[PDB]
Amino acid sequence: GTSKLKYVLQDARFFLIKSNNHENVSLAKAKGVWSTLPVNEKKLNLAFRSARSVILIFSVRESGKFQGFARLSSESHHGGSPIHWVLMLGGVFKIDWICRRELPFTKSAHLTNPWNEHKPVKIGRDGQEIELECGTQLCLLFPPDESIDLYQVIHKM
């Protein structure tokens, strides 16, 4: 079903995350963490305090797909075990995956982002905010991820 997913996405904010390689998204999916450049880190920390859910939607450059989406569960923090990213970085955000399934860009061609000049939602710099309606519809396009139980996500809201 899609009802708990819709509940998590209610009044959420959405951000496009662009990774230069699959290895970093694999690490993020395995460890439940993300790190970004300080300009985006400041934006995400502000968003985390502002909305019931902040959703990161991941795309590996040149892949032609999104690789899933996750919800911030913390503001960024420093002083953890160093993550072996394949690259100046900021803190580490904890994230809870909502969908680890991929979505090809061909399926999102009807969705444009008003915060990026109404360009197709696949287009955007790392950290580009996606307006609520576009972001909700994009997340709902992904194949359901039956490995994830959103009961655990919901109580953190």
Give CA angle at 126 (121, 132), nearest 5°: 45
Task: Tell me, letter by letter, the H, E, C secondary structure of the chain.
Answer: CCHHHHHHHCCCEEEEEEECCHHHHHHHHHHCEECCCHHHHHHHHHHHHHCCCEEEEEEECCCCEEEEEEEECCCCECCCCCCCCCCCCCCEEEEEEEECCCEEHHHHCCCEEHHHCCEECCCCCCCCEECHHHHHHHHHHCCCCCCCCHHHHHHHC
- Please indicate if the annotation marks 20 as binding a ligand: yes
Domain that holds residue 56: 1-157
* Residue 18 among known ligand-binding residues: yes
Resolution of the PDB structure in angstroms: 1.3
CB of 63 closer than 8 Å to CB of 115: no
CA-based R_g, the chain, Å: 14
Phi and psi dihedrals of 10, rounded to 5?
Answer: -60, 125
Give me the CATH number covering residue 69.
Answer: 3.10.590.10
Cα dihedral 103, 104, 110, 113, rounded to 10, equals: 70
C-alpha distances in Å from residue 100, one per residue of 29, 46, 79, 147: 7, 25, 27, 9
What residues does 142 pair with on adjacent strands?
none
107 touches 141 (CB < 8 A): yes
For this PDB entry, the determination method is X-ray
Number of neighbours of residue 109 by Cβ within 10 angstroms: 11
Question: Is 97 marked as a binding-site residue?
Answer: no
**Residue 35 known to bind ligand:** yes
| Six-digit token string for 48 | 């985390």
116 in a known ligand binding site: no
Work out how many domains the chain is built from and give that number. 1
Distance CA 126, CA 29 (A): 18
> Is residue 96 annotated as involved in ligand binding?
no
Contact 69, 148 (CB under 8 A): no
Q: Residue 146 contacts by C-beta under 8 Å, 6 or more apart in sequence? A: none
4 labelled as ligand-binding? no
CA separation for the pair 102, 122 (Å, rounded): 13
CA dihedral over 27, 29, 30, 31, signed as positive or negative: positive
d(CA 12, CA 21): 27
Q: In the numeric block, which tokens belong to residue 108?
A: 């999102």
Q: Which residue has the tokens 């803190």?
A: 91
